[PDB]
Amino acid sequence: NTHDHILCFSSRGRVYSMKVYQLPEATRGARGRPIVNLLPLEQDERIT
């Protein structure tokens, strides 16, 4: 996608969490694995 698209994320509990691609973290081709739970509001047992 491009840098200015919007995201409709759907979790395992089937919840609509809105976001924009400005927000996820970007880095080089290396050991990159930022945290999932920090940006959206999610429960303990749910995955996008």
Place this chain on the structure above:
DNA sequence: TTTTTTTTTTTTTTTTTTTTTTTTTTTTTTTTTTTTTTTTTTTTTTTTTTTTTTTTTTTTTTTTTTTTTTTTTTTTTTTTTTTTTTTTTTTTTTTTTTTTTTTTTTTTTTTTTTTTTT
């Protein structure tokens, strides 16, 4: 000249309250430990021409079991109502600006006296 009534602050020490020294629990803070990023080079992996024998798709025909199909009655869907959460106007409070009004503290230096400890 003697004698009689009343008034209060002290002998007060005890009850009530206040002040002042204390130490359990949730919120900070320094340490070690584990996630990130950049270089060397290094055998190692991986990109790109040529040849080759392969093995799956397209001439043609067959059927059968998934695609047709109509209809009963469920049950998810939608409606209204009310509660819970989110979010934004509203209000309140506090801070800074520059001329005014007010104050308050810590130490040297010597020499003499109180004021506790041994």
